[PDB]
Design a protein around this ligand. Structure first.
Ligand SMILES: Nc1nc2c(ncn2[C@@H]2O[C@@H]3COP(=O)(O)O[C@H]4[C@@H](O)[C@H](n5cnc6c(N)ncnc65)O[C@@H]4COP(=O)(O)O[C@H]3[C@H]2O)c(=O)[nH]1
Ligand SMILES: [Zn+2]
Length: 360
């Protein structure tokens, strides 16, 4: 696949400033209103908008948004659930004083399902006729921590609640974030000093679910790594140091998106998301730390590599969480073999035929 061809694909995917500003405007309005109302409750008094960009989370329908609501919770003690390395029970190190979330305390362990239920109930109750815009809440997805809204019957916004911990990161993230040879150890050091988040996601237990667990989240770190991606600090700040990392990520995401859209009737690709792609891309970034390995003239090659590695992850059924190395996103427990084989087939076909799926 030619680099000029790929860059032409990315070129035709660019949206005008008007659409971006309009959609961002509507989303911002709804979000701000929901914050102002969410602060009416003592449990969600310290709620706030977490900076993850909140834009460009969909190349092309680019009306789908993703915002994250951080909730500052002080002095929490985490307990790793069944060595899942990613799912924890939330407790409090010292709780003599009445906790704002005490209404959600199922004993010593903070209930995730109750907080999520309350959150969803507040939002659902306060998106009706209070807005000079038409907002509807989408059907509750199975085991999804997100609360999705539809604005003006065109804009989708995923709202995820997240507990915030300014404590040091869990021990499961010790060997994670291998950006030493890429973004330097100093950057990793200052990054690990930043807080980490927890989303109300239950873990699988054979043929049952816990609903009391929370999953680690480092979306903000992902944003930071994304916007500052070069070994050189001046990467992509001049013509001589223009790389093709972001182009590769965009192309991968668009490939997965187009494949998911094409086989929407089937249920094979439903569990696959742009996060898997992003993770694989991060691993590839670790494998190729030099900016010279991401030269803009080698877009075709680099992207190819990004495809190949992704395929490897599908074939070997191994895709380690970039922050939690022992957490496998492509385990057989999460995604079945048949789905991964299907995706593999579609991708191999696309690459073998000069990506006809980009022609739309
Ligand atoms: N900003 C943010 N949103 C999250 C996070 N975790 C879940 N969400 C939201 O809930 C939706 C479904 O969550 P799921 O955990 O039940 O299945 C997810 C999960 O299995 C996996 N995944 C996505 N982000 C992940 C993440 N940050 N960590 C671990 N797994 C993740 O891919 C599935 C679909 O992701 P999606 O990006 O299209 O939408 C998320 C996403 O909009 C999160 O950590 N950060
Ligand atoms: Zn760059």
């Amino acid at each position: 696949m030619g680099a000029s061809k790929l860059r032409a694909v990315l070129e035709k995917l660019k949206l005008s400033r008007d659409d971006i500003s309009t959609a961002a405007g509507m989303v911002k309005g709804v979000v701000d209103h929901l914050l102002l109302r969410l602060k009416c409750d003592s449990a969600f008094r310290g709620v706030g908008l977490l900076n993850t960009g909140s834009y460009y989370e969909h190349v092309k329908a680019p009306n789908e948004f993703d915002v994250m609501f951080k909730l500052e919770v002080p002095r929490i003690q985490l307990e790793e659930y069944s060595n899942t390395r990613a799912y924890y029970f939330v407790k409090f190190k010292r709780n003599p004083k009445e906790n704002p979330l005490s209404q959600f305390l199922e004993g010593e362990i903070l209930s995730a399902s109750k907080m999520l239920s309350k959150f969803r109930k507040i939002i659902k109750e306060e998106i009706n006729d209070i807005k000079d815009t038409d907002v509807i809440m989408k059907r509750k997805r199975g085991g999804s921590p997100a609360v999705t809204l539809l604005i003006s019957e065109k804009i989708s916004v995923d709202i995820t609640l997240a507990l915030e911990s300014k404590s040091s990161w869990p021990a499961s993230t010790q060997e994670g974030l291998r950006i030493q040879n890429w973004l330097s150890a100093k950057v990793r050091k200052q990054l690990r000093l930043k807080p980490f988040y927890l989303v109300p996601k239950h873990a699988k237990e054979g043929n049952g679910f816990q609903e009391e667990t929370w999953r680690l989240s480092f979306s903000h770190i992902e944003k930071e790594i994304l916007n500052n991606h070069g070994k050189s600090k001046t990467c992509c700040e001049n013509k001589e140091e223009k790389c093709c990392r972001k182009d590769c990520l965009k192309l991968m995401k668009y490939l997965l998106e187009q494949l998911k859209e094409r086989f929407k009737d089937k249920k094979h690709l439903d569990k696959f998301s742009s996060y898997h792609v992003k993770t694989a891309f991060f691993h590839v970034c670790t494998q190729n730390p030099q900016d010279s390995q991401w030269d803009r003239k080698d877009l075709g090659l680099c992207f190819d590599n990004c495809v190949t590695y992704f395929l490897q992850c599908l074939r070997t059924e191994k895709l380690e969480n970039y922050f939690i190395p022992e957490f496998n996103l492509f385990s057989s427990n999460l995604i079945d073999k048949r789905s991964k084989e299907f995706l593999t087939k579609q991708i191999e076909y696309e690459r073998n035929n000069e990506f006809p799926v980009f022609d739309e």
